[PDB]
Amino acid sequence: SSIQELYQSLKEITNLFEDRITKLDFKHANDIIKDRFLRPSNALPWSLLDMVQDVPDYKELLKVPDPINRTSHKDGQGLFDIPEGMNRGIKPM
Amino acid sequence: SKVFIATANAGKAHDADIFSVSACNSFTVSCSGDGYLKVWDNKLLDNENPKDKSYSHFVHKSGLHHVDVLQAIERDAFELCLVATTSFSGDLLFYRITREDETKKVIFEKLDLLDSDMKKHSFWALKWGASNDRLLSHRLVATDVKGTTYIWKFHPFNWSPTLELQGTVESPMTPSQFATSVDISERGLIATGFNNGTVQISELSTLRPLYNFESQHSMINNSNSIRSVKFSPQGSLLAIAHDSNSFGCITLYETEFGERIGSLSVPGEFAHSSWVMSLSFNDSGETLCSAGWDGKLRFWDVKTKERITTLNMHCDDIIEEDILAVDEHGDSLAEPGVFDVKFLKKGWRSLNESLCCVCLDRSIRWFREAG
Amino acid sequence: KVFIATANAGKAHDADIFSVSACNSFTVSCSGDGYLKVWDNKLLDNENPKDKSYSHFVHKSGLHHVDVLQAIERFELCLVATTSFSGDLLFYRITREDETKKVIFEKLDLLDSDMKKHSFWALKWGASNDRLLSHRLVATDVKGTTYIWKFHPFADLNWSPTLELQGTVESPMTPSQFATSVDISERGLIATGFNNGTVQISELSTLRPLYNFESNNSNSIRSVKFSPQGSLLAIAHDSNSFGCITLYETEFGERIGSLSVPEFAHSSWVMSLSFNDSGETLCSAGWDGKLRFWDVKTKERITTLNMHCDDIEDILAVDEHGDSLAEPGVFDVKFLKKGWRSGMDLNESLCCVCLDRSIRWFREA
Amino acid sequence: MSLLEQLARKRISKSASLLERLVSLSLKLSALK
């Protein structure tokens, strides 16, 4: 029932279009049940990984300015404290 | 932002699904599952029915799923035109296309180019390679169901065509897989795609492997299958259309160093909601068109990896007597899927670029770029 | 307020009883064994209901939806439409034998070969009121499309039935969803519910959508109902293994309020809804085995009936795991108008099909 | 054998009761010195 044998069988077909109907008919249950429910597997299922697996710098999100080639409103102790279009500034918490 | 507008349609062109389309300067050809090769004239006047300038030929009962055309000026005056198709039974067939001066009708003349031994293989894909100063002769490549690739050299000569087998390339894995795709580059490279998500690059001159890409992270055995491989006409880029389970993805690779550049996605990284069926580059190679099972044509900018525009297919876009809104079982064809798509050069469909696609409603549609 | 049992038929079907419907002459039930059963309403003072019962095998895959249309044309018309698990919309004509009162079923072929290739799920008959000249039938398919027909009993009094398709209404969302419930209003409105909690209201006059709604594991819409008089839409939808009821005003689509008991109405899913003739009382069938009656204006519970104990403080009690302490129950419920059922006449009636494969009848005292 | 591995090797119910009966750059720089 190998695919190569089936393809070799196809090669025996020799010469208006017709929509023909196939003649194919569309133990086994025991094998399916054993595979689904009672077969220990080499690879651990997600249920056991759910039990044995444990999950493990702001300067990295910024952009450093590029090099430059030139050849070919309020205040406080001298420091700005409020940005433009804003009303508070910064307050650590 | 490019704009594409419909120019000609033809509904119910074939009696079954149209799986592939190919075009040349003189005409466009399509193949379908009903076993017919249909020729559509490119030199069609405005406001003329494409079906009037049509010619048909019966090839095989099992049906056809691939087609390609090779047209060239071989001698100073000789005209060459060949069509190669693979059937559902696994046969590779060749035909010659000629015309009369009396009535300009197309003549189909069968060619026997394969030897006895080569006829026992089941072929799936095919592709033509024209001579454009890379080598003196034309070439034909094809893949079989056992994972092997075949390379031929075609000699037109007195009319005596011969196919000389240059060699074969076997699959890089054991057990062998299914070779679903193949392509040829101008620089002389061969790309073959497999059903497990593996694509292999080999040299045309020496027939030796160079790269072996894997794009799959699979728990299901064949949930990552490669559907289309396309080489960029100008650069060293390769486009891979593969399957993510329930999705369609396009990945870009560079063939000079063998690196994964990135993926195409619209706002995971997925290009189409359903599986991507076909890919096509334009003449410049700066635009890529993808056909999807979701019934859309999407155009991408290759340089910026960004989508440019989208075309939606409707069954009502067709002559009202050639509209197929329901198939033989009763399913709705309101937004039919697209099987194949192809770019046409300027001056072929009479300037600017043109485009053709075949959809799930047994319709063939032509579009042209505005501007 | 108090409801008293009148008749009870146990082990009526050989599978699940999914739907029930009634008219002035009989109550009709459908089951998963593919049978239609007709129960004569004009029962005696004390008689076993199975004596007046008639069965008919319809389809091998079973049946889950049923509805009956009764009207006087000019002639007595009684027509039953049912839906099969295979997706077939089937029509039967109900007649009575003159001599022996035996019930005769006649199958009708109203759909052409093109229309018989769809998969239908829900259906609903639209009676001819003062606003509507002809009877109408609405049905939904597994792809979310709603179909509207017109029924013509006569030709050009010759009996020649004909179903004329007015048009279709597409689902309001892409990708489409499963259309699970449908209803038609006497004023000319159509409501359609979907499996994701969306309700769409369209117009019968011109067949275009009016507006849309949105109502966590399960969120399916189980039943959409229109008030017999006035502008009111009642929707039964699922919480996570819980039942909810919400009311909408149905002119511009404004939420009015929900029905709740100590915001859920039932411990399990709410299976069906049914307004009475006046529209002032609403009954709910739940998968916890109870029927709850509500006051529409007050939005407060009136009474509760238990299908597991005849003897009749009401809370939604659940165990440690979160499951209801009450066992599974009613599939479907339906009000029967005054005078429909013969007995000791001037009171509303009720019908109920349960998981025990039994059908129960109640009368208000 | 790694230092960690050497150090580690130098340092070194009713349910159950029912079962009873059964790198390069530095090297290059040094070499070129």
Partner: protein, 644 residues
């Protein structure tokens, strides 16, 4: 060059330079075009070609400096720009031409200013005399040295700004205070010569985010004042506010940035972090996905955050292997992390996340390499610093690596690694080590099972596992192994264990399903009736959770095996009534409905399943379509063969 074409310009310049290899300008222009091409390739995403062009540029620069004996600021700036490519593409940092670089740095005649060298401590002699120095540190030192040799105050200001930028890059990459101090010194020197620069202010503000929030806030305001049409300074302000735990300020700034300049992934990433801080999970996940999608592949922070979020959301969620969407998300996370490793390898957190993701995806071949790299990293870290706390992490990674070998079929290696991990963790007494102990016991038991079928030590390890914890899935696994042994006593003990779990704890579906399967396979017609009556009384919640319909399947099997009639379709009818939009339900009832339910995106289906649905229409057109979808499907080819 300035418009996009480099190949033609490169060919023109190479042809020009061949017969005129005596003029400085020709080679300098060739170097400039090569550098710009390499940077454009890096921006496009051609990393290997970028490093190749960078190596060629460095060789040409060596030729210029040594053979031609020429010097200029432009060539040094070009070299500094080229050297950044090796640091950015850290996966290829070992291809740095150290010989050419040292020859170039030795052939120059440099005066030397000690003002910056006192804090920098970076010199040619110190770089040459290096012992146990990482590749990245050497690359950063070479970048700083290249920036330092480029010797009204405009040029001096640019020179100091370049030095400060290089020192900031080294400080961010290596995380050492001396580089930060040197960067601050260089920026202070640069500002004193030309204040209206708008980029030395940004660098100064980044350099002092942690030292002082007031100084860092004075910057990013002057920078905005000197140049208002930029979104980077506002993002820096938002990040500074987020570092100082000021959520409202950062949220307001990020909302302003989103309104003004959409299609930029950085504000979305910042808002994702903000919402994650506030305890919101769903909105943070949506923002992370949006930020990942918007950036294509130009941001690795977005890739890392998306992968981490996906792993966090699907690590104890009770998922099933048959969930197609979860597999899609895990595959996307794996690909994103694979692209992340081309620029930032040797990161422990990302490596552990990738190992977990690959373990859940059953990709053990790549997990082996990742685990080997992680083990090497841990060993090198212990060699550098001899803290003994590394043993615990070492043992946990050993347990991971033992789990990896089990899936590859290497049972002896699993036994070895699990024994080592158990030996280290034997003290334990911590909840973190309990999972590792359970994992080691499971691995040892299964390895002893599959290795020559040796059962005594298997039983000992399963006894230890049961003593450590009495869980549902552990009991199911033990029962499965005992049943697979095949002896009568083992089957009896497995059934008894399952029944005692049912008695001791509450009722369950998985244990009931296993008992049903054992009864069916052994054909115990006495217990089958009780199993059937227990399976037909499931509550509604358990039916909602059972979205793959195992219970109706087993109910139908038992019904058809016992009563020998077609009664098993009633459970499927009720499941269809309750869940009409489920693909698994309609298989036994109607195939036309099943085909339409998964056609136009109504349900998520794979190509193989769609091909199977097409071929079941039993006509030539549908069979041809299904075979076109999956030509390797045996049933499609059989149907096509039987058509003729």
């Amino acid at each position: 060059c300035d418009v996009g074409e480099y190949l033609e310009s490169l060919d023109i310049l190479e042809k020009v330079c061949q017969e005129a290899a005596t003029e400085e300008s020709f080679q300098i222009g060739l170097v400039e075009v090569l550098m710009r091409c390499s940077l454009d390739l890096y921006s496009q995403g051609f990393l290997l070609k970028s490093v190749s062009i960078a190596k060629d540029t460095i060789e040409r620069i060596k030729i210029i400096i040594s053979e031609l004996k020429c010097e200029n600021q432009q060539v040094w700036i070009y070299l500094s720009q080229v050297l950044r490519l090796f640091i950015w593409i850290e996966s290829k940092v070992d291809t740095l031409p150290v010989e050419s670089l040292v020859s170039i740095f030795e052939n120059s005649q440099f005066s030397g200013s000690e003002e910056i060298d006192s804090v920098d401590n970076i010199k040619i002699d110190t770089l040459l005399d290096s012992t146990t120095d990482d590749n990245v540190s050497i690359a950063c030192k070479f970048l700083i040295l290249a920036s330092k040799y480029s010797v009204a105050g405009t040029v001096r200001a640019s020179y100091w700004y370049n030095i400060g930028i290089s020192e900031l890059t080294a400080f961010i990459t290596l995380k050492e205070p001396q580089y930060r101090d040197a960067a601050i010194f260089a920026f202070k020197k640069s500002i004193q010569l030309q204040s209206n620069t708008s980029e030395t202010w940004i660098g100064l503000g980044i350099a002092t985010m942690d030292i002082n929030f007031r100084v860092s806030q004075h910057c990013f305001i002057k920078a905005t004042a000197l140049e208002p049409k930029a979104t980077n300074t506002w993002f820096n302000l938002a990040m500074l506010g987020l570092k100082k735990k000021d959520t409202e300020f950062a949220q307001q700034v990020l909302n302003k940035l989103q309104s003004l300049a959409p299609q930029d992934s950085s504000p979305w990433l910042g808002m994702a972090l903000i919402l994650e801080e506030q305890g919101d999970i769903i909105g943070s996940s949506k923002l992370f996905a949006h930020s990942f999608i918007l950036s294509n592949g130009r941001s690795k922070a977005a890739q890392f955050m998306y992968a981490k979020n996906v792993l966090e959301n699907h690590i104890n969620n009770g998922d099933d292997e048959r969930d197609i969407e979860t597999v899609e998300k895990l595959t996307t996370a794996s690909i994103a992390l694979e692209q992340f490793f081309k620029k930032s390898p040797d990161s422990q957190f990302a490596l552990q996340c990738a190992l977990l993701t690959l373990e859940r995806l059953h990709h053990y071949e790549n997990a082996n390499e990742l685990a080997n790299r992680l083990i090497g990293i841990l060993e090198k870290k212990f060699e550098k610093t001899q803290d003994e706390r590394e043993l615990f992490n070492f043992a946990i990674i050993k347990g991971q690596f033992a789990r990896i070998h089990l899936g590859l079929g290497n049972f002896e290696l699993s036994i070895e690694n699990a024994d080592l991990s158990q030996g280290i963790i034997s003290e334990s007494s911590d909840e973190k080590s309990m999972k590792t102990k359970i994992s080691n016991h499971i691995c040892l038991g299964l390895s002893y099972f599959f290795l020559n079928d040796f059962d005594q030590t298997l039983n000992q390890f399963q006894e230890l596992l049961s003593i450590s914890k009495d869980s549902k899935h552990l009991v199911v696994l033990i029962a499965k192994v005992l049943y697979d042994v095949g002896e009568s006593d083992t089957k009896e003990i497995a059934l008894q264990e399952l029944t005692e779990y049912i008695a001791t704890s509450g009722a369950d579906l998985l244990v009931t399903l296993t008992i049903a399967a054992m009864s069916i396979l052994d054909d115990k017609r006495e217990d089958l009736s009780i199993i059937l009556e227990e399976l037909k009384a499931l509550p509604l919640s358990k039916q909602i959770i059972d979205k793959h319909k195992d219970a109706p399947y087993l109910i139908e099997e038992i019904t058809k095996r016992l009563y020998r009639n077609d009664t098993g379709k009633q459970v499927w009818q009720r499941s269809a009534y309750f869940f009409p939009n489920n693909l698994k339900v309609w298989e036994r009832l109607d195939k036309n409905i099943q085909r339409r339910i998964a056609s136009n995106g109504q349900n998520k289906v794979t190509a193989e399943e769609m091909s199977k649905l097409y071929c079941e229409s039993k006509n030539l057109r549908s069979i041809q379509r299904g075979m076109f979808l999956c030509p390797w499907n045996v049933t499609a080819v059989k149907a096509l063969n039987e058509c003729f």
